[PDB]
Design a protein around this ligand. Structure first.
Ligand SMILES: [Ca+2]
Lengths: 29, 223
């Protein structure tokens, strides 16, 4: 997956950049 | 940083934290007024925090300066992360001293196998989240272009290199973006992306700073 290593909060996968997804504790990864 | 050790307070004096109410990316001080980081770290209203170790406690050596201008590379592609580099000009010049110092730009690209130092306040777990209070460090080798291209078919451009461990377990991770990869005392890479963190056969990918040195120098002297 292409997932940039920025720290970003999220509530759903669509909140994250590129192919990062939203993990269980509320941050993209 | 996953699988790292603790750098020690102010032992990486060129490391900065970019803050928009919380830490979200790193950067490196390249002179008193300019920071280089990753273009995907662009945000309006960045505060640059220098002289940091524990990002939650005031320890006395910090300088907090707002960004006055961020210049994203002209060819940055947000879909492929090609040319993932940005320069940030500080509103006022930082006071350089023993705890806050700039890092030199490279005169040549580093070769595969060179050991480099990667640092940041990013996630320390490959599965799960544990975000550290103090700066973490990792020594990792530059990998060959073949290994890099092999690990990420069709996703590596000439402006990227891989560094890390094909076995996994040690890598940069979310919150480390924009931070430094230093080899031989020169800034050779910027933390950019990967497929997760510290996964087997998925080493971190870094912006290849030696391809941009004339652009950086031209931009700094002209703004
Ligand atoms: Ca602090």
């Amino acid at each position: 997956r292409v997932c940039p290593k920025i720290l970003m909060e999220c509530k759903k996968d669509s909140d994250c950049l590129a192919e990062c997804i939203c993990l269980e504790h509320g941050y993209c990864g | 940083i996953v699988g790292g050790y603790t750098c020690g307070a102010n032992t990486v004096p060129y490391q900065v934290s970019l803050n928009s109410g919380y830490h979200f990316c790193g950067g490196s001080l390249i002179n008193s007024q300019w920071v280089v980081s990753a273009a995907h770290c662009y945000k309006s209203g960045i505060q640059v925090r220098l002289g940091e170790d524990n990002i939650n406690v005031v320890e006395g050596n910090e300088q907090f300066i707002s960004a006055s201008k961020s210049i994203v590379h002209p060819s940055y592609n947000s879909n492929t992360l090609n040319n993932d580099i940005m320069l940030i000009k500080l509103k006022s010049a930082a006071s350089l001293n023993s705890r806050v110092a700039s890092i030199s730009l490279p005169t040549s690209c580093a070769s595969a196998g060179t050991q480099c130092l990667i640092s940041g306040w990013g996630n320390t777990k490959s599965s799960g989240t544990s975000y550290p209070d103090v700066l973490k460090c990792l020594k990792a080798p530059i990998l060959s272009d073949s290994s890099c291209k092999s690990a990420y078919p069709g996703q590596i451009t000439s402006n990227m290199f891989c560094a890390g461990y094909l076995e996994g377990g040690k890598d940069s991770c979310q919150g480390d973006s924009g931070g430094p990869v230093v080899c031989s005392g020169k800034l050779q890479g910027i933390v950019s992306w990967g497929s997760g963190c510290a996964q087997k056969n998925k080493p971190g990918v870094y912006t290849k700073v030696c391809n941009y040195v004339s652009w950086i120098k031209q931009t700094i002297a002209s703004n």
